[PDB]
Write an enzyme that holds these catalytic residues in place. Structure first.
Site, PDB file in Angstrom:
ATOM      1  N   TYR B 155      46.114 -19.708  -1.000  1.00 55.40           N
ATOM      2  CA  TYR B 155      46.797 -18.528  -1.664  1.00 55.40           C
ATOM      3  C   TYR B 155      46.500 -18.451  -2.895  1.00 55.40           C
ATOM      4  O   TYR B 155      46.384 -17.692  -3.663  1.00 55.40           O
ATOM      5  CB  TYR B 155      48.103 -18.135  -1.140  1.00 55.40           C
ATOM      6  CG  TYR B 155      48.600 -16.825  -1.355  1.00 55.40           C
ATOM      7  CD1 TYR B 155      47.810 -15.782  -0.311  1.00 55.40           C
ATOM      8  CD2 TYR B 155      49.527 -16.430  -2.050  1.00 55.40           C
ATOM      9  CE1 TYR B 155      48.226 -14.484  -0.546  1.00 55.40           C
ATOM     10  CE2 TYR B 155      49.829 -15.018  -2.185  1.00 55.40           C
ATOM     11  CZ  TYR B 155      49.347 -14.092  -1.308  1.00 55.40           C
ATOM     12  OH  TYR B 155      49.775 -12.596  -1.189  1.00 55.40           O
ATOM     13  N   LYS B 162      51.238 -12.206  -7.304  1.00 58.30           N
ATOM     14  CA  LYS B 162      52.395 -11.639  -6.495  1.00 58.30           C
ATOM     15  C   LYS B 162      53.632 -12.039  -7.300  1.00 58.30           C
ATOM     16  O   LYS B 162      54.740 -11.351  -6.887  1.00 58.30           O
ATOM     17  CB  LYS B 162      52.458 -12.270  -5.132  1.00 58.30           C
ATOM     18  CG  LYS B 162      51.167 -11.799  -4.060  1.00 58.30           C
ATOM     19  CD  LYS B 162      51.315 -10.264  -3.832  1.00 58.30           C
ATOM     20  CE  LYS B 162      50.204  -9.764  -2.932  1.00 58.30           C
ATOM     21  NZ  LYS B 162      50.298  -8.446  -2.734  1.00 58.30           N
TER      22      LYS B 162
HETATM   23  N1  LIG Z   1      47.768  -8.928   6.104  1.00 61.40           N
HETATM   24  C1  LIG Z   1      48.970  -9.566   5.845  1.00 61.40           C
HETATM   25  O1  LIG Z   1      49.443 -10.513   6.559  1.00 61.40           O
HETATM   26  C2  LIG Z   1      49.989  -9.316   4.647  1.00 61.40           C
HETATM   27  C3  LIG Z   1      50.925 -10.451   4.495  1.00 61.40           C
HETATM   28  C4  LIG Z   1      51.858 -10.071   3.274  1.00 61.40           C
HETATM   29  C5  LIG Z   1      51.635  -9.132   2.215  1.00 61.40           C
HETATM   30  N2  LIG Z   1      50.496  -8.191   2.492  1.00 61.40           N
HETATM   31  C6  LIG Z   1      49.976  -7.355   1.515  1.00 61.40           C
HETATM   32  O2  LIG Z   1      49.706  -6.140   1.983  1.00 61.40           O
HETATM   33  C7  LIG Z   1      49.024  -5.212   1.253  1.00 61.40           C
HETATM   34  C8  LIG Z   1      47.887  -4.731   2.022  1.00 61.40           C
HETATM   35  O3  LIG Z   1      47.021  -5.859   2.538  1.00 61.40           O
HETATM   36  P1  LIG Z   1      46.477  -5.297   4.058  1.00 61.40           P
HETATM   37  O4  LIG Z   1      46.662  -6.382   4.952  1.00 61.40           O
HETATM   38  O5  LIG Z   1      46.931  -3.968   4.519  1.00 61.40           O
HETATM   39  O6  LIG Z   1      44.759  -5.428   3.558  1.00 61.40           O
HETATM   40  P2  LIG Z   1      43.722  -4.300   3.574  1.00 61.40           P
HETATM   41  O7  LIG Z   1      42.501  -4.675   3.251  1.00 61.40           O
HETATM   42  O8  LIG Z   1      43.872  -3.472   4.650  1.00 61.40           O
HETATM   43  O9  LIG Z   1      44.211  -3.180   2.319  1.00 61.40           O
HETATM   44  C9  LIG Z   1      44.043  -3.623   1.048  1.00 61.40           C
HETATM   45  C10 LIG Z   1      43.699  -2.575   0.091  1.00 61.40           C
HETATM   46  O10 LIG Z   1      43.401  -2.678  -1.259  1.00 61.40           O
HETATM   47  C11 LIG Z   1      42.897  -1.810  -1.689  1.00 61.40           C
HETATM   48  N3  LIG Z   1      42.195  -2.127  -2.771  1.00 61.40           N
HETATM   49  C12 LIG Z   1      41.609  -2.984  -3.401  1.00 61.40           C
HETATM   50  N4  LIG Z   1      41.197  -3.076  -4.661  1.00 61.40           N
HETATM   51  C13 LIG Z   1      41.525  -1.607  -4.983  1.00 61.40           C
HETATM   52  C14 LIG Z   1      41.320  -1.068  -6.497  1.00 61.40           C
HETATM   53  N5  LIG Z   1      40.556  -1.451  -7.465  1.00 61.40           N
HETATM   54  N6  LIG Z   1      41.724   0.380  -6.273  1.00 61.40           N
HETATM   55  C15 LIG Z   1      42.161   1.067  -5.247  1.00 61.40           C
HETATM   56  N7  LIG Z   1      42.632   0.259  -4.007  1.00 61.40           N
HETATM   57  C16 LIG Z   1      42.086  -0.950  -3.949  1.00 61.40           C
HETATM   58  C17 LIG Z   1      41.753  -1.734  -0.695  1.00 61.40           C
HETATM   59  O11 LIG Z   1      40.841  -0.751  -0.697  1.00 61.40           O
HETATM   60  C18 LIG Z   1      42.566  -1.834   0.404  1.00 61.40           C
HETATM   61  O12 LIG Z   1      42.856  -0.664   1.122  1.00 61.40           O
HETATM   62  C19 LIG Z   1      48.831  -6.389  -0.030  1.00 61.40           C
HETATM   63  O13 LIG Z   1      49.472  -6.225  -0.996  1.00 61.40           O
HETATM   64  C20 LIG Z   1      48.653  -7.542   0.639  1.00 61.40           C
HETATM   65  O14 LIG Z   1      48.516  -8.480  -0.122  1.00 61.40           O
HETATM   66  C21 LIG Z   1      49.607  -8.427   3.583  1.00 61.40           C
HETATM   67  O1  LIG Z   2      48.594 -11.050   0.553  1.00 61.98           O
HETATM   68  C1  LIG Z   2      48.139 -11.476   1.701  1.00 61.98           C
HETATM   69  C2  LIG Z   2      48.929 -12.294   2.534  1.00 61.98           C
HETATM   70  C3  LIG Z   2      48.738 -12.887   3.631  1.00 61.98           C
HETATM   71 CL1  LIG Z   2      49.459 -14.121   4.522  1.00 61.98          CL
HETATM   72  C4  LIG Z   2      47.300 -12.327   4.527  1.00 61.98           C
HETATM   73  C5  LIG Z   2      46.701 -11.577   3.605  1.00 61.98           C
HETATM   74  C6  LIG Z   2      47.072 -11.022   2.304  1.00 61.98           C
HETATM   75  O2  LIG Z   2      46.304  -9.774   1.593  1.00 61.98           O
HETATM   76  C7  LIG Z   2      45.107 -10.156   0.951  1.00 61.98           C
HETATM   77  C8  LIG Z   2      45.244 -11.448  -0.218  1.00 61.98           C
HETATM   78  C9  LIG Z   2      44.109 -11.569  -0.839  1.00 61.98           C
HETATM   79  C10 LIG Z   2      42.913 -10.439  -0.948  1.00 61.98           C
HETATM   80 CL2  LIG Z   2      41.622 -10.873  -1.814  1.00 61.98          CL
HETATM   81  C11 LIG Z   2      42.952  -9.479   0.144  1.00 61.98           C
HETATM   82  C12 LIG Z   2      44.273  -9.236   0.912  1.00 61.98           C
HETATM   83 CL3  LIG Z   2      44.145  -7.895   2.026  1.00 61.98          CL
END
Ligand SMILES: NC(=O)c1ccc[n+]([C@@H]2O[C@H](COP(=O)([O-])OP(=O)(O)OC[C@H]3O[C@@H](n4cnc5c(N)ncnc54)[C@H](O)[C@@H]3O)[C@@H](O)[C@H]2O)c1
Ligand SMILES: Oc1cc(Cl)ccc1Oc1ccc(Cl)cc1Cl
Ligand SMILES: NC(=O)c1ccc[n+]([C@@H]2O[C@H](COP(=O)([O-])OP(=O)(O)OC[C@H]3O[C@@H](n4cnc5c(N)ncnc54)[C@H](O)[C@@H]3O)[C@@H](O)[C@H]2O)c1
Ligand SMILES: Oc1cc(Cl)ccc1Oc1ccc(Cl)cc1Cl
EC number: 1.3.1.9
Lengths: 257, 247
Positions: B155, B162
């Site tokens: 990470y 974060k």
């Molecule tokens: N997927 C997980 O397991 C997980 C766990 C904890 C937290 N999160 C958090 O959830 C949030 C969403 O992640 P996700 O899993 O839906 O992935 P995601 O790829 O579906 O969405 C991430 C988004 O970030 C947007 N983005 C990136 N750079 C940008 C910019 N410069 N301007 C405008 N938009 C921009 C993307 O276009 C995209 O829509 C994040 O904050 C992520 O870290 C995800």
């Molecule tokens: O924050 C996250 C935490 C987990 Cl467990 C899984 C995905 C996550 O989301 C991101 C983290 C780094 C980058 Cl480059 C893009 C994304 Cl979508």
């Protein structure tokens, strides 16, 4: 002292009232060989003097905003200390217009970038540049503040930077631990340093804290200095990735008013 | 719907797997009127499609990397929503090379700057640009992860970004509360499709959370039902973070 045989590099020493000086004094009292750095040529002479009084003639320039400056400083250091036992990171900065008034109104993308770059990234930038120089048993230390954990008026974006810094301590500790290196931080209570004594109402603030702090007084660069020495010595061999609160217990209390 | 009468802006929709997608579906189910942003030309189509499927025709471009893009977006939104009730910040990014291997070796000044700028600064950036448009009782929400509180392999720098973001939540909540605005975050557990099925075994509820789980918590945190919650990071990870050594 308990730091005999240790070689520690100390940054941020720009005055006798600074926290870095307090830390240097204590490590030297404990028998550690020191080395100091200074931000710019303007502080060169002044810092070579503080170092002199601490049995050191190793005074190098280093602006942590530049990877080249960091690499050059460690290269110079390597000429005397091909290997050493860690460093004290007492560096922080944010443009002045960032630390006053409503946070959302004062913060800017630029103010934010600089605050995090200088106050947080620099800690790991230094680690990267001297990683191969560290002896097993080394210890890295940085300084934080309660603002990283709680929203405090005026601290604003420095709060985010310090939060980033404390996370940096944990990730650094986790990555460097396997090679025998510990990384910790001290979250110090407010102290009237040269820089600190520059912000308005800092006198009245210290007064406020004394009344609501468990030990009923603000901490001193001496208190911080002794805890720092401990954290960089082998006495703290079991501690890593920790943020030790050296604020007289202020953060663990609430509503003593 | 406990969200009826509310107008919320939802960012970060990139696919049907986006957390923002599960969030938008939840809020719509609860009666919220929605507006959407898309980062670039690549994702515009997908977002228009989903925006339409949710009875919305407010789809605006926004790249939080540029202050001008943010101002322009809120300027357009103001034409149809002179005032609204908050927004869901589901945006994150860091160059790929940053999220692999030893943290100290992987991190670079540039990677650090980008991760923090896009993943943390953007949240307050959006708040700055639409501050005067927020109605009293408005709510802002962002998404974080345990990596902010613990050192998690790979990470790396996103963990610091974060941590910065969670502090941003606290400062924003303290700054905007007087105007009747609350700011919170959800620390989501990893969502099933860095393999896992491990957390799914050591998590109290014995399963990873879904975008539906996150979606419902998100709807709540942006509704008047959570009027007493602000500057809080709610863990929606099935209790994984509060347990230790279940292995
Ligand atoms: N997927 C997980 O397991 C997980 C766990 C904890 C937290 N999160 C958090 O959830 C949030 C969403 O992640 P996700 O899993 O839906 O992935 P995601 O790829 O579906 O969405 C991430 C988004 O970030 C947007 N983005 C990136 N750079 C940008 C910019 N410069 N301007 C405008 N938009 C921009 C993307 O276009 C995209 O829509 C994040 O904050 C992520 O870290 C995800
Ligand atoms: O924050 C996250 C935490 C987990 Cl467990 C899984 C995905 C996550 O989301 C991101 C983290 C780094 C980058 Cl480059 C893009 C994304 Cl979508
Ligand atoms: N003063 C307090 O009450 C207090 C409370 C908690 C934490 N801290 C922390 O203690 C540390 C020291 O602060 P201080 O109070 O002794 O003030 P200080 O002015 O004595 O030292 C801060 C140092 O940062 C250095 N620095 C800034 N930018 C630099 C750069 N680009 N390159 C190299 N060096 C740079 C300065 O030159 C200076 O030496 C900080 O991390 C600070 O935030 C201070
Ligand atoms: O972190 C600190 C916390 C406190 Cl209570 C007092 C001083 C501190 O240190 C600084 C913070 C911001 C800038 Cl620009 C310079 C310095 Cl020396």
């Amino acid at each position: 002292g308990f730091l005999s045989g240790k070689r520690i590099l100390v940054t941020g020493v720009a005055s006798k009232l600074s926290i870095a000086y307090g830390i240097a004094q204590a490590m030297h009292r404990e028998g550690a060989e020191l080395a100091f750095t200074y931000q710019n040529d303007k502080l060169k002479g002044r810092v070579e003097e503080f170092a002199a009084q601490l049995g050191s003639d190793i005074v190098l320039q280093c602006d942590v905003a530049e990877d080249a400056s960091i690499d050059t400083m460690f290269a110079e250091l390597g000429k005397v200390w091909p290997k050493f036992d860690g460093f004290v990171h007492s560096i922080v900065f944010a443009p002045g217009d960032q630390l006053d008034g409503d946070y959302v109104n004062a913060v800017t993308r630029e103010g934010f970038k600089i605050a995090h770059d200088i106050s947080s990234y620099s800690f790991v930038a230094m680690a990267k540049a001297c990683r191969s120089m560290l002896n097993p048993g080394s210890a890295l230390l940085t300084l934080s503040y309660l603002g990283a954990e709680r929203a405090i008026p005026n601290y604003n974006v420095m709060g985010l930077a310090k939060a980033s810094l404390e996370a940096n301590v944990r990730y650094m500790a986790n990555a460097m631990g396997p090679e025998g290196v510990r990384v910790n931080a001290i979250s110090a209570g407010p102290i009237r340093t040269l820089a600190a004594s520059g912000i308005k109402d800092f006198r009245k603030m210290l007064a406020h804290c004394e009344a609501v702090t468990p030990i009923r007084r603000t901490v001193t660069i001496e208190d911080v200095g002794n805890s720092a020495a401990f954290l960089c010595s082998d006495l703290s061999a079991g501690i890593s990735g920790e943020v030790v609160h050296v604020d007289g217990g202020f953060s663990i209390a609430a509503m003593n008013e």
